[PDB]
Each structure stands twice: as C-alpha cells, then as structure tokens.
Curated annotation (Swiss-Prot):
Phosphorylation by CK2 disrupt the intramolecular binding between the bromo domain 2 and the NPS region and promotes binding between the NPS and the BID regions, leading to activate the protein and promote binding to acetylated histones. In absence of phosphorylation, BRD4 does not localize to p53/TP53 target gene promoters, phosphorylation promoting recruitment to p53/TP53 target promoters. It is linked to Cornelia de Lange syndrome 6: A form of Cornelia de Lange syndrome, a clinically heterogeneous developmental disorder associated with malformations affecting multiple systems. It is characterized by facial dysmorphisms, abnormal hands and feet, growth delay, cognitive retardation, hirsutism, gastroesophageal dysfunction and cardiac, ophthalmologic and genitourinary anomalies. CDLS6 inheritance is autosomal dominant. The NET domain mediates interaction with a number of chromatin proteins involved in transcription regulation (NSD3, JMJD6, CHD4, GLTSCR1 and ATAD5). The C-terminal (CTD) region mediates interaction and recruitment of CDK9 and CCNT1 subunits of the P-TEFb complex. It is also required for maintenance of higher-order chromatin structure. This is Bromodomain-containing protein 4. Ubiquitously expressed. There is a cross-link at K58 (Glycyl lysine isopeptide (Lys-Gly) (interchain with G-Cter in SUMO2)). Signal peptide: none annotated. It comes from the Eukaryota. JQ1, a thieno-triazolo-1,4-diazepine derivative, and I-BET, a benzodiazepine derivative, have been tested on tumors with success. Treatment with GSK1210151A (I-BET151, a I-BET derivative) has strong effets on mixed lineage leukemia and promotes myeloid differentiation and leukemia stem-cell depletion. Residues 17-123 form the Bromo domain. Interacts with p53/TP53; the interaction is direct. Interacts (via CTD region) with CDK9 and CCNT1, acting as an associated component of P-TEFb complex. Interacts with RELA (when acetylated at 'Lys-310'). Interacts (via NET domain) with NSD3, CHD4, BICRA and ATAD5. The interaction with BICRA bridges BRD4 to the GBAF complex. Interacts (via NET domain) with JMJD6 (via JmjC and N-terminal domains); the interaction is stronger in presence of ssRNA and recruits JMJD6 on distal enhancers. Interacts with NSD3. Interacts with NIPBL. (Microbial infection) Interacts with bovine papillomavirus type 1 regulatory protein E2. This interactions may serve for the tethering of viral genomes to host mitotic chromosomes allowing successful partitioning of the viral genome during cell division. The record marks N99 as: Acetylated histone binding. Disulfide bonds: none annotated.
Length: 127
C-alpha cells in the first residue's frame, strides 16, 4: 500500500492543446530519451515497494517519470511546452535530491538531462 497513486495523465477538466512545440517534445525529445540505454529506470513511477525504498515518498513529494510524461504528451494533457519541460526537470531534480552525487542512477540522469537540454535548445518556434 505504500506507493502513492501515480501522477494523473488525463483530466477532463484540464484544457487540451496540440502545438508544434508539444509535437516536437513527443516526436523528438521524448523519443530520443525514451529509447536511450539509461532510460529504463525513468520509464515508470518509482516503485518504492519493489525497490525497497521506504523513505522515497517521505522525501519526494512531487514524483515524476518519463512514462507519465509520455502519456501526458500522447493524451494532449499539456497546454504548452513549458509544462512538459517542467515535468522533465522535476524528474531529474527528484533523482538528484534523493540519491547521492556520483551514484550510477545520478550519472544516468545527468546523461539523459544533457541530451534533453541539447534537444530543448533546438525547440522550434510556435506556428
Ligand atoms: C537507484 O534508482 C533507481 N533504481 C531503479 C528505478 C528508479 C530509480 C530511481 C530514480 C530514477 N530516481 O530515484 C531512484 C531511486 N526504477 C527501476 C529499477 N529497477 C532496478 O533494478 N533499479 C535499480 C535498483 C538498484 C540499483 C540500481 C537500479 O537501477 C539503476 F541501475 F538503473 F540505477 C531501478
């Protein structure tokens, strides 16, 4: 019982939108990171039960992962690119806060973040 509900990926009361920046975030940015060799620990919510991390959700109150982001993009959950970018940043930050510098998972997150920033640097202008 000790995992919280995952972050919502749909909401009938949240306005939905399709922009070329959000299309780019799904088709280029997420795609790039999703299939990367270090992606797998970030492809779903942290299962603190299975991973035996009892203190995870005592420390991390704003969980986020790429599985959630991918679904949010696919479901047109975001109104703009900044909402999505914020979620990626939350994911990386959680990893850096909970784990110690130099830990393998931190190195993995840093590699993904470097790639993320490279791709966001080339975010296209709005149509
Ligand atoms: C260590 O952080 C995470 N590990 C996850 C994991 C999530 C994390 C994680 C993240 C991301 N941010 O904080 C933590 C903790 N999800 C699944 C999974 N399966 C698995 O065997 N592992 C795993 C377990 C122990 C040591 C390393 C592990 O993965 C790693 F090599 F990639 F680092 C994980």
């Amino acid at each position: 019982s000790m995992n919280p509900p995952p972050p919502e990926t749909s909401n009938p009361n949240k306005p939905k939108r399709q922009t070329n920046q959000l299309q780019y975030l799904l088709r280029v940015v997420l795609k790039t990171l999703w299939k990367h060799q270090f992606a797998w620990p970030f492809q779903q919510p942290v299962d603190a039960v299975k991973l035996n991390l009892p203190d995870y959700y005592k420390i991390i109150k704003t969980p986020m992962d790429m599985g959630t982001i991918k679904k949010r993009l696919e479901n047109n959950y975001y109104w703009n690119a900044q909402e999505c970018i914020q979620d990626f940043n939350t994911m990386f930050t959680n990893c850096y806060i909970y784990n110690k510098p130099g830990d393998d998972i931190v190195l993995m997150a840093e590699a993904l973040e470097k790639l993320f920033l490279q791709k966001i640097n080339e975010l296209p202008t709005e149509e």
